[PDB]
Amino acid sequence: MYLTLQEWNARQRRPRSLETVRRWVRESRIFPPPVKDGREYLFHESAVKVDLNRP
Numbered sequence: 001m002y003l004t005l006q007e008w009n010a011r012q013r014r015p016r017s018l019e020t021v022r023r024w025v026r027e028s029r030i031f032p033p034p035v036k037d038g039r040e041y042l043f044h045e046s047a048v049k050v051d052l053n054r055p
Contacts, residue, residue, distance in 0.1 A: 002042065002043065002044045002045040004042065004043060012049065030047055031047070031048070031050060
């Protein structure tokens with residue numbers, strides 16, 4: 001009952017391109033990382049874009 005990358009970003013009120021998110025994951029800005037299903041990426045409902053250090 002989670003959400004795929006597409007919808008995963010549809011929840012943010014200020015998202016961007018998909019490949020743009022791929023950079024975020026590279027910088028480890030999101031967590032927990034997506035499931036590298038060989039080639040796809042499942043964004044568990046636990047995935048979220050972090051800011052810096054002030055939750």
